[PDB]
Structures are given as structure tokens and as C-alpha cells.
């Protein structure tokens, strides 16, 4: 299946194609030995990323992936041995096939697992903005609105830049378009919310009945912004 993320694709596509399969099989010990060295290094980096992370999901999912490419590389190292003895060995032929297949899967798994880690980081940036929207209803003075704008202003900015950088990476197009729209809606809606609050606060500090009205446009805007951010979160996970 299609590797999502322009990065996973450049790593795995060339060899995913090749893995789409007679007589003589040349002597593979030199090349298979370079696979074996590289997979040792991958497992190395894996173990490191595990002890170094604070993500619980990454800790339980990444190891089973090193192991899978590790045992798959074993099958490749052994298939070479065998093919050297009998170039026409049908056994050996299959270990090589499954060996390579295992290496493709595990590596892919490992990266799918690492990609999920990065998505959670992003998800948490969103949840931060979602939290801070729920605090909108408590701003009642005009100087407390200034505090608010000061924190949420830059916060929206960080979210925008980082969703933007994320979408450019996906290799699915509808997913890319869903994100971009949703980040646009939320960005357009920020000055609307401030204006909404600015109206509430004024209508409060002056007492003018149209405060029933102001409070519900404020709320409608908070809701529309929240509905969208949850949509960003959903899409992030495909």
C-alpha cells in the first residue's frame, strides 16, 4: 500500500518495487553482509530512541519492529550461506524472498510507529489551543482580554506553522486539502473571536441588554473553532 509521507516513500518505495518476483544465483555474502551491518545499526538507533523518548506508545510498539527486521535479516544471512552451497536450492530461494519481505515490513512498521510519535506531539499543540479556547468565557474586563490575546495570538501562530509543515509531507491529497482548509477556517476565525469578546466585555462594563446576543456569538465562534481543531486532529491520524 501507498506510503503516506513523502519521506517514508523515498526510503521504502525503491525496494518495495524490487520485492516483486529458474537457475543460477550469484554469491550474495558480500551484499547480504552489508544489509546485516545496516540492520544492526537500525536496531542500535531503535533501542536509543526507546530509552530516550517520553512516549509510552513508542516504547511498546518500536521494539517488536526492530525484532521483526532482526529475525528477517537472519533469514537473509542464512539464505546466502545455503545458496553458496547450491545456487539452485529452492529452499534458499524462499528464505531470501521472505527474508527481504520481512525486512521491508519491519522497517515500514518501525517508521509507521515513529511517525505516530511525531503526530502526537502535533496533536498536543492542537489540544493546547483547544484548552485555551474554553477559557474565553471567563474574560470580563478589558485588560483581561489583552492578557488573553497576548497568549493565544502567538499560540495560534505556532499551530499554523506546524500544521502547514506537516501537510506538505503527506502523499495523500485529499488529506492535505482537509488540513489546509481547517487551519484556514481557524485562522480567519481568530479576529472574529477577539472582536466577539471585545463586544462582550464592552456590553458588560456598560450594561446594555444585548449581552445575551454577544455571549452567544462568542460561544458560537468558540464552538466553530473547536469543531475544526478536532477535525484537524482526526485527519492528522490517516
Amino acid at each position: 500500500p501507498v506510503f503516506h509521507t513523502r519521506t517514508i516513500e523515498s526510503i521504502l518505495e525503491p525496494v518495495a518495487q524490487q520485492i516483486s518476483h529458474g537457475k543460477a544465483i550469484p554469491d550474495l555474502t558480500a551484499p547480504v553482509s552489508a544489509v546485516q551491518a545496516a540492520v544492526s545499526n537500525l536496531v542500535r538507533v531503535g533501542k536509543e530512541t526507546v530509552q530516550t523518548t517520553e512516549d509510552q506508545i513508542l516504547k511498546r510498539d518500536m521494539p517488536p519492529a526492530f525484532i521483526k527486521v532482526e529475525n528477517a535479516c537472519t533469514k537473509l544471512v542464512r539464505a546466502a550461506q545455503m545458496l553458496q552451497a547450491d545456487p539452485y536450492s529452492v529452499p534458499a530461494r524462499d528464505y531470501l524472498i521472505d527474508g527481504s519481505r520481512g525486512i521491508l515490513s519491519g522497517t515500514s512498521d518501525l517508521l509507521l510507529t515513529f511517525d505516530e510519535a511525531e503526530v502526537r506531539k502535533i496533536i498536543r499543540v492542537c489540544k493546547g489551543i483547544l484548552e485555551y479556547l474554553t477559557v474565553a468565557e471567563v474574560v470580563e474586563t478589558m485588560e483581561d482580554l489583552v492578557t488573553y490575546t497576548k497568549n493565544l495570538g502567538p499560540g495560534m501562530t505556532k499551530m499554523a506553522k506546524m500544521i502547514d509543515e506537516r501537510q506538505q509531507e503527506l502523499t495523500h491529497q485529499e488529506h492535505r486539502v482537509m488540513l489546509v482548509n481547517s487551519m484556514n477556517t481557524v485562522k480567519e476565525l481568530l479576529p472574529v473571536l477577539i472582536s466577539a469578546m471585545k463586544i462582550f466585555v464592552t456590553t458588560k462594563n456598560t450594561k446594555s441588554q444585548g449581552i445575551e446576543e454577544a455571549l452567544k456569538n462568542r460561544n458560537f465562534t468558540v464552538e466553530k473553532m473547536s469543531a475544526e481543531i478536532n477535525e484537524i486532529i482526526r485527519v492528522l491520524q490517516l
Binding site: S10, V15, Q18, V35, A38, L42, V45, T49, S100, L111
Partner: peptide
């Protein structure tokens, strides 16, 4: 991350085995 470069070094290595059939 270092993860990507290591994975690529296994993807490349493996290609060289297969390009020998």
C-alpha cells in the same frame, strides 16, 4: 532523526542484494 538515515541505509543495502538477481 537518525532513524530515517539508518532505515535508508538498510533499504539501500537490501536493494543491492536484490539488484544481483
Amino acid at each position: 532523526x537518525x532513524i530515517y538515515x539508518x532505515a535508508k541505509x538498510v533499504x539501500x543495502x537490501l536493494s543491492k542484494v536484490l539488484x544481483x538477481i
